[PDB]
Structure formats: C-alpha cells, structure tokens
Design a binder for this molecule. Structure first.
Ligand SMILES: [Zn+2]
Lengths: 751, 49, 53, 287
C-alpha cells in the first residue's frame, strides 16, 4: 500500500512536472532529480519487461520524454499494429501540435529501416505534419527502389488530398527531380501528377451508373412556381444530374427556362455548370454554341453564368484557362464579368496565391459596389488559401467600416474567413481583438473565421465565446451564425453534438433553432447517428417556417446513403414526401426548402455522396468550403451552387495500369437485397459475389468496408491487403496472356 | 509485474471515481438543462403570448 | 484499449466540463430575458380601458 | 424589365422624427417628406425627415406647395444637407395604414421622378407602447399583372416581412399593393451617446443623491411596506395551512392556478433591499 501510493503519487507528480516542463523547451528549465528518473524508469522498465502491449506507448506519451518510446518499439511484435495503435492513441488526445509533429517525424524513421516500408504510417503522418523535409526522401526513394506499382497508391492519395499548396510545391519538387530509367521515370512523374484519370474513371462509372425516375421530376413540374421555387427545381436537377452531363432533361423545351428575364436564368446556367464538369472542349464549345450568331446576347446572365459555370467546371484543374480569363475579364461589362467572372476566376485560381488576381481583384472591389465586392471577397478568400498576406487583412478590415453596404461586409467577411486556415497559434489575438467589434456582420466574421482555423477539435476555448455570444448577445445574427463554427470544430465526434445542441433544437428564438438545425445538418452529415434523427420530429412541426426549412435540410443531410432495413426512416421519408403535396397550404419558402431538401437525396442518383473527412482522417478543404458556402444560401441563394465541390463519390479502385482496365469481383458477407436501391413507384442470406465489376463500382457504405471478403480463387490480387475502402492498384499475379482489356466509350453527352 | 493489475488497477479505480465526478457533472448538466428547458418553455410561452 | 480509455476519456472530461460555464450563462441570461419579456407583457396592460360585462 | 431585392435603411433620425410627428399625428391628415441619397439599385438610405404644415384638404397633391418644398429644400442645400428627396410619409389614424385612392394617385404622380418612391405610414394612435413596428409601402406596376407579381430575390427576409400578418389589410388589400422589408443601423456614437444617455436618464445627477434617500427610507416608509408584505405573507399562509390537507388527500392533478412560490420569492427580493443598502449605509457611515 505504502510503496504503491508513493510510486503512484510519484508518477502522477512526475508526469505533472513533465507537463509543466513540456511546453517550455528552453529557458527557466526546472531541475529534475536523477533518483526520480531512476525510480520511475525502474518500475517503468519492470512494466517494459513484456510491455503488456497496452501501456508502452501510453505511459511513453504521458511522460513527454524524447527517447522513452524508441526502446519500446525495439522488442515488440506486430510493428504496424504498434504504430497504428500509437497514432490512433495520439490522434485521440487533443494534441497541441507542439509534440505530435516531433513524435511522428521520429516514428517515421523506423519503417524505412525495416524490410519493407508501410503506407498507412506515411499517409497518417503526412496528413498532419505537412513538412517538406519528410517527403523529399520518399519522393527520391521511388527511383532507387525501381518499383512502379507501389508508388501509384501513395502518389494517387497524396495528390488526391491532405494538401493544396504543399502539392503546388511538391509538383515542382518532383518536376526538378529527373531529366530537365530515363524513359520510364519521365512517364512516371508526368502521369502521377496528372490527376485527370480520376475524373475520367468517375465520368465513366458515373456515366454508366445513373438512375433517373419520372416521378421526382414530374412532381417538381407539378409543384413548380414561376417566382421562388423555379431555382429550386433547377438546383435539384443540377443535384441529380451532377457529373452525368445529362442535358437531355433540359432539352425537352426552352419555354420553361428562359420564360423570365431575372436571376433564375443565371441560376439555371450555373446549375448547368453543376450538371457537367471536367471538360476542356465541350464546356467552352457548349457555352459558345448556344448563340453563335450575333455575339450579343439579350440576356447577359447567359454570359455571366458561362463564366461562373466555367469556373465550376475548371475547379482545381491543371489545365486552367485562367490566362484567357484575364483577357476576357479585361472587357468592360455590366456586373456579369465582375460578379460571375470574379467567382469563376477566383474558384479556378483557388490556392494559387497569385498576386495578379490579387491586384485585379482589388481594382475590381475598388468601385465600392456590394455585388462585385461580395464576389471579390468570395474569390479572394479562395485564392488566398494559406497565403496570409500582411496588408490584405488590414486592407479588408480597413475597407469594411468605410462603407455602408452589407453585401460588401459579408463578402469580405467570408473573404477574411476562408483565408484563415492553420493559424491556430496565430489568429488568437486577431480573432479575440475582432470579436469586440461594433459591427454584427464582422462579429459573425470572427466566428466564421475561427471556424476553419480550429478544425479538428483542437481548441476547447473558442466554444466559450461561441456559445457565450450565442446566448449573451441580443442580435440574432451572431446567434444563428454562431454554432456553425461549433459544428465545424466538433465535426469529429457525431455523438457528442446532439447532447449539447439538443437544448438549441427548441431554443428561445427561432434563429438559434435555425442555426442549430444547420449545426445538426453539418455535424451528423454522412454518419448514421440517430441522436439527431429522433430529434427531427419536433423540429419539423412549428408555426415558424425557419425551423421547418432548416429541419428539412438537416433531415435531408442525414438520410443520404442509408438503407431502410437498418433504421426506420419511413417517418421522415413520408413527412418529407408530404411537403410537396402540402405546399398549397404551406409557406412559399417552406416548399422551396422542401423540394430543395428533396433534391439532396436524389443527388447523382444515390451514387455520389458527401464526406467531411478523408479515409486517413484528414478533412477536405473544398468539402468544408462547399458545405459552409452551401449554408450561406440564406443571404444569397445562388451561392448554393458550390455544393458540387463537396461531392465525394464512394467506390473502390482496382486500376492496375493507366491504360489497362481489369475486372475485380469480390464478395460481401451481408445480404445483397439489403444493399439494393429503393426503387420508387412506377407512375407512368449471403451473396455469391459483389456487383462491382470492370474495375463500374457502385455506392458503398463506410460500414460495408468491414464485411468485404476477397475471393481466394481470384486470378489477380494486389500487393497490399485490401482492408478498408480507398484508392489502390492491382498487382498482376499471373503475369501472362489474357489480361481482359475492355474498350472505351464513345462520343455523346460527355467528350 | 503486478503493476497493470495493481498500480494501474488502482489508477483505473481512481479513473472510475473520476467517472463518478463526471456523473455529478453529468447529472448536474442533465437537471440544469431540464430546468433550462422549463425556463425556456415558459419564456417561449409568454413569447407565444 | 485498456490504458487508452484514460486519455481518450479525458476528452470527454473536457467536453463535459466546458458545459458548466455554458449552462451558467444560459441560466443567468435566459432569466434576464424572462424578466425582460415579463415586464414587456406586463407594461402592455394599461389603466385606460373600456369596461364590459 | 428588371427587378432587384431592395431594403429600406431606417436610422433613428427618421424614426424619432416620425415619433414626434406621431405625437403631432392629429386625426387630421398630415404631410411629410423624406430625404436621402441613392447609392445603388437595391439599397435606399434616409437621413433628413421634416414635417409639413397641415391643411383643410389633407393629403393631396394640391397641398404640396412647390415653392415651399423647393424653398425649404434649397435652404437645406445651402446648409450641410446635400440630399435629394426620396419619398413622402403621412399618418392614417383609425381606419388602418392602408392607402386610399387619393393616396395612390398622389403616389402615382410623385413617383414619376423617383423610381423607388418610398412610402411610410406611421400610426401610433391604436398601436400599443410595447411595439413600435412600422412598415414601408411600395407601388407595383399595373402592366406586371400578366407576369409574376413580385420577382424579388432573397426570399429569406420575407419571414421577417410576415410579422404584419393582419388578416384583412395585408392580403385583404394585397392586390396591386405590396410592401418591403425594414432594417435599422446604429453606429458607435449613437450606441454610446444614446446608451449612456438612457442609462443616465434612469440614473441620478451625481449618482449618489437618491441612494441614501432609500437607505434611510427603509426605516421610515419601507417599514410599512414590510409590515404589509408580512400581511400578504400571512394572508397566504392562512391558506397554506389548508394546503397540506388537500395535498394529504388527493396528490393527483393541479386545480389552483396560483403557485404561492414566485410571489413570495418576489417578496424576498423586495425584502433584500434592506440587506443590499445596509452595506451602503456602512459605506456612508465609514467614509
Ligand atoms: Zn382619413
């Protein structure tokens, strides 16, 4: 008892002093006696006799010591399980990034010394540390190892996610390496940074997996109005026809689109830009073929929607036409090239951090107009991702209070909000200083700005003033715009959100109910937590149309990618279907958010979905941007078109060669009828193998990734054991004739 | 050995007492948020007035 | 899993501990709003009025 | 053929001028003119608002004297008021805030110059002092009956425009007669000057004068309020003696709407003034 209490309090005070001295690496270092190290490391080594495979990395991490864990991984079984369990424990402790990066950059030196390098550790580290010195070795080891098949996975997912400007630097870092196996390394380095092969395969299986029903579109035509929901019908049509380039639905008649000269045609052409994407010739040619007669359209919304739609098409592409968009933006026109051209050019130049678009953007916002300054802010936030210019923040906040318009204040609000990414240790005094501003719009801009800065649940301090300004402030602007940052920082755990926002479900004012509905919409999206679903029933019935609209949107963001046999969704399916027939006795905006909510489930024909994080746990920047701008439809409804930037299709990839397409057929341990499609009305115990072939992989639930079983009789098999869904390649095991090459499609709606 | 079962055993029991303190904070949050729902329902009721 | 429950649980300790000052703010502010709306609906009742039956 | 989403900016100038003009809002018809500056299409800001002399005819185009209007506007031009007129306002007591044929005719005649022609009708006569909710009116084009009525974007603020939901006037006369949303604006000078001015309007001169008045009235006047307070306390306890019988018999359901608790809590709050001011007397006696 005595010995275990004195070593218990001795270890507690030991790690207490280790925490008190862990944040101060140099200067005023407190003296630590050596006998404490002896008696802590003595019983610690006694625990490290066999390590019991549970406390080695735990106590090794609690002591915050440098070489305490290097001797633990020396004699240890299942090294990948020890590094995967190690990083799993490290990612769940709410690190401050002061030591996590060092622990990772020192734990990546062990697998290079082993017989083979692993990819899960270099991915799970390179998604957090983002250091150039940790990739310069692995990019040049690909030539020394002379292994082509293993590099395609790491190249595909590193070029896929976890970085934008670090990729903009690694593309020239790999461009410098090589010639200014020479014949093979050239096609390797060229073909790995392409990134258009994913767009080609997505266009392929997504071009041959579409499923459309006449009941939905016919119901929209039955409930369409000429004033409000006209944009809801075309945005739902853009949702369901995204990626498939199916303009044949809009080729039925021209009297249903251009019947009114207003922003409805701009949202119709922008919705057309949401329909088709990833085209270098059919996009500009399709936009120019509409009226190549006089070069003078009576309605300029076709041109502005051509520039905004073109910016939607060429988002994050490597073959940008920005050089031509500067000479096209130089033309003097009335607010079409300014607003739509600023949005399209800024979206196409997102992450480039070019000073040219900064200069022309500033001279575009120097006209004091609220619309071109709103689009100028939306574009400046996108292009300034990670730049953090010195005079830009002070120039925008100085440009804010010297004008009376509100769209300029919200445009520069999102502009200074999106620019702040990864500035956790920097924007403390900036956001804390700008939180006491007299302007409520900028008060919302502080929370929207701190939203993306504190992603990952790394700061429990900002929630104090988020909820403190949500409850304490008298203006409902920061109250309904407050909890979006709470969901953006607490997006990691879906269970903990409804426990603390359940009080906000039925709040005092309807504004906190609506913003809380957005919070439940963003926090539980893509998950299966019923803690919001059981609370959706009180949200959908209230005399206020705000909580009904946000309740239908929040209900629409959860029912996506879900089967009926797992959970009883009949209640929200029926109450969601009764809104388009009950629209006669409902409000004009309630049916707008109703059918707009119905377009979410039918988006892409159940094939494409959304995701807040990647497979390795890192969060996608264009997904968070797309969902926050998607929630910014309250002030400006045409801003909802950025939802396509967050569409992440769920499927698998078994592509072995860049030009050869194999066929991989696995089997599932579940029932095939439970995973089928909920076929609607006409309105005129184990499967032998899966339905994924020629790799056209269909949708896949994240819970289905644990029940997949590769066949033992399969002719081909990759080198890496396929355990979780992602992007991998196929390894030719037979290395013989009859690779089963399949042809390619032909001209049509796509290229 | 006799540390993970005894030393970390009493450390885990102290963690269970910490779970009891989080049960006092837990149910204090529960009844405080239920009274918060009562005051919110009454002030919302006079708001309906 | 056995030893990870401590440090993993600490995140729940912070997430539940942060709600204390929050529910303090709600219970101190919503009653101020309760007397605001209470006096607002109280001052509606004016002395000049008509007497019926 | 184009329409946008306009919103009328209302500062405290036009508000307080419509409150003094509402105090002078006699049953007789009154006239007023709003001023401001047009910066863009979908925003309108009012700054200068004055009143007009009454006439036996009332609200009419003949009552508007062009030499008096242009004379006062010129006298505003020689001063630091370089703003053009943006609309005209008036009062409609009793019969509702709706617009008659004469008002829509002088509106049609006065909208030939300004395309916006903001119209505001203040009616503080039957409106309670709890709310000062005012609404701005607009004129629709007679040729837009074939197409949609109001092709106004940003339909979010219509939920805030649904607060005037009277079941006779808004949709009782909504044909050819619609409305527009209203927002406010306040800078830091109005916030601190008017906030500290109202707090001082509820405070004292030196702020130390009327404290000892109540601190020493606790011994002379409040003693009567404490004895009467105990008379109400005992006057409820005489029934609280009978409460444990019913509570000792039924225990199911509540039939008396009286709570007997919060009133006594308020009595304790009024009784705590002695405790809170005892330290005040301790400070006055000390130093
Ligand atoms: Zn009259």
């Amino acid at each position: 008892e005595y010995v275990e209490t004195i070593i218990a309090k001795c270890i507690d005070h030991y790690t207490k002093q280790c925490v008190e001295n862990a944040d101060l690496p140099e200067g005023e270092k407190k003296p630590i006696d050596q006998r404490l190290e002896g008696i802590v490391n003595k019983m610690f080594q006694r625990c490290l006799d066999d390590h019991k495979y549970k406390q080695a990395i735990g106590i090794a991490l609690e002591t915050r010591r440098l070489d305490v864990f290097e001797k633990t991984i020396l004699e240890s079984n299942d090294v990948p399980g020890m590094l995967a369990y190690s990083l799993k424990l490290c990612m769940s402790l709410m690190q401050n990034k002061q030591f996590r990066n060092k622990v990772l950059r020192v734990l990546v030196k062990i697998y290079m010394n082993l017989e083979k390098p692993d990819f899960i550790n270099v991915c799970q580290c390179l998604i957090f540390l983002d250091d150039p010195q940790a990739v310069s070795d692995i990019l040049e080891k690909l030539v020394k190892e002379d292994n082509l098949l293993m590099a395609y996975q790491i190249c595909f997912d590193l070029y896929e996610s976890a970085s934008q400007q670090f990729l903009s630097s690694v593309i020239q870092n790999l461009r410098t390496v090589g010639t200014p196996e020479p014949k093979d390394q050239t096609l390797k380095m060229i073909k790995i940074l392409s990134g258009e092969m994913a767009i080609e395969l997505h266009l392929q299986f997504l071009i041959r997996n579409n499923n459309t029903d006449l009941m939905i579109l016919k119901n929209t035509k039955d409930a369409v109005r000429n004033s409000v929901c006209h944009t809801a019908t075309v945005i739902a049509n853009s949702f369901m026809h995204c990626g498939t380039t199916s303009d044949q639905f809009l080729r039925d008649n021209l009297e249903w689109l251009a019947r009114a000269t207003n922003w409805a045609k701009f949202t119709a052409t922008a919705s057309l830009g949401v329909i088709h994407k990833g085209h270098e010739k059919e996009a500009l040619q399709l936009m120019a073929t509409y009226l190549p007669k006089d070069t003078s359209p009576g309605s300029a919304y076709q041109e502005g929607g051509g520039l905004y739609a073109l910016g939607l098409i060429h988002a994050n592409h490597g073959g940008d036409i920005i050089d031509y968009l500067l000479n096209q933006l130089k033309n003097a026109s009335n607010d079409i090239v300014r607003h739509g051209g600023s949005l399209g050019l800024g979206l196409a130049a997102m992450g480039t951090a070019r000073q040219d678009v900064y200069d022309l953007l500033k001279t575009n916002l120097y006209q004091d107009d609220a619309v071109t300054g709103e689009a100028a802010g939306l574009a400046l936030g996108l292009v300034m991702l990670g730049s953090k210019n010195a005079q830009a923040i002070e120039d925008m906040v100085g440009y804010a209070q010297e004008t009376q318009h509100e769209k300029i204040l919200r445009g520069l609000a999102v502009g200074i909000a999106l620019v702040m990414y990864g500035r956790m240790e920097e924007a403390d005094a900036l956001i804390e200083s700008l939180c006491r501003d007299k302007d409520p719009i900028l008060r919302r801009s502080g929370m929207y700005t701190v939203a993306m800065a504190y992603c990952g649940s790394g700061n429990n301090k900002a929630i104090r003033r988020l909820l403190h300004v949500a409850v304490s402030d008298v203006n409902d602007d920061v109250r309904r715009a407050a909890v979006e940052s709470l969901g953006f920082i607490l997006f990691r755990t879906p269970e903990q959100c409804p426990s603390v926002v359940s009080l906000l479900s039925e709040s005092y004012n309807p504004h906190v109910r609506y913003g809380a509905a957005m919070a439940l919409g963003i926090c539980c999206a893509g998950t299966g937590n019923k803690e919001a679903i059981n609370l959706l029933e009180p949200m959908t019935n209230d005399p206020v149309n705000y909580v009904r609209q946000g309740a239908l949107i929040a209900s629409a963001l959860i029912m996506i990618q879900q089967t009926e046999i797992t959970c009883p969704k009949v209640n929200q399916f029926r109450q969601l279907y009764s809104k388009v027939i009950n629209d006669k006795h409902d409000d004009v905006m309630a049916k707008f958010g109703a059918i707009l909510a119905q377009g979410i489930l039918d988006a892409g024909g159940h094939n494409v979905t959304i995701s807040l994080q990647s497979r390795t746990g890192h969060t996608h920047m264009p997904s968070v941007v797309g969902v926050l701008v998607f929630t910014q439809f309250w002030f400006w409804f045409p801003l909802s078109h950025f939802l396509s930037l967050a569409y992440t299709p769920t499927c698998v990839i078994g592509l072995n060669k860049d030009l050869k397409m194999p066929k991989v057929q696995y089997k599932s341990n579940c029932k095939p009828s439970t995973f089928a499609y909920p076929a609607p009305l006409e309105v005129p115990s184990i499967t032998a193998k899966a339905k994924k072939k020629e790799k056209n992989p269909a949708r896949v639930m994240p819970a289905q990734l644990k029940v997949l079983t590769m066949p033992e009789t399969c002719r081909y098999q990759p080198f890496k054991p396929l355990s979780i869904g992602g992007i991998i390649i196929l390894k030719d095991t037979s290395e013989d004739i009859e690779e089963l090459v399949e042809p390619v499609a032909a001209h049509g709606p796509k290229i | 050995l006799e540390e993970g079962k005894a030393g970390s055993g009493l450390r885990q029991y102290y963690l269970s007492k910490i779970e009891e303190l989080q049960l006092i904070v837990n149910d204090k949050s529960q009844n405080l948020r239920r009274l918060q729902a009562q005051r919110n329902e009454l002030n919302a009721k006079v708001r309906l007035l | 899993d056995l030893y990870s429950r401590y440090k993993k649980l600490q995140q729940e300790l912070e997430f539940l501990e942060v709600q204390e000052e929050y529910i303090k703010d709600e219970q101190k502010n919503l009653k101020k709003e309760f007397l605001h709306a209470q006096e607002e609906v109280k001052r509606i009742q004016s002395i000049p009025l008509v007497i019926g039956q | 053929a184009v329409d946008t989403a306009e919103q009328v900016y209302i500062s405290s100038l036009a508000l307080l001028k419509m409150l003094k003009h509402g105090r002078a809002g006699v049953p007789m018809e009154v006239m007023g003119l709003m001023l401001g500056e047009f910066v863009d299409d979908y925003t309108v800001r009012v700054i200068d608002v004055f009143a007009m002399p009454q006439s036996g005819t009332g609200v009419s185009v003949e009552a508007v004297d062009p030499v008096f209007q242009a004379k006062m506007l010129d006298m505003l031009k020689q001063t630091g008021r370089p703003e053009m007129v943006v609309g005209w306002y008036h009062s409609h007591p009793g019969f509702g805030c709706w617009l008659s044929g004469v008002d829509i005719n002088t509106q049609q005649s006065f909208e030939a110059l300004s395309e916006r022609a903001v119209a505001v009708v203040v009616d503080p006569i039957q409106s309670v002092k709890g709310k000062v909710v005012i609404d701005a009116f607009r004129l629709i084009n007679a040729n837009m009956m074939v197409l949609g009525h109001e092709p106004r974007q940003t339909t979010s603020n219509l939920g805030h425009l649904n607060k005037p939901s009277i079941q006779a006037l808004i949709h009782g006369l909504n044909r050819h007669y619609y409305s527009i949303t209203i927002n406010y604006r306040k800078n830091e000078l109005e916030q601190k000057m008017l906030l500290n001015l109202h707090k001082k309007s509820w405070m004292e001169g030196l702020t130390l004068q009327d404290y000892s008045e109540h601190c020493k009235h606790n011994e002379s006047v409040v003693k009567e309020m404490l004895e009467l307070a105990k008379n109400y306390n005992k006057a409820v306890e005489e029934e609280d003696k009978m409460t444990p019988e019913q509570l000792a018999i039924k225990n199911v359901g509540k039939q008396d709407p009286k709570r007997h608790l919060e009133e006594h809590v308020d009595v304790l709050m009024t009784s705590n003034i002695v405790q809170c001011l005892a330290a005040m007397l301790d400070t006055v006696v000390f130093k």
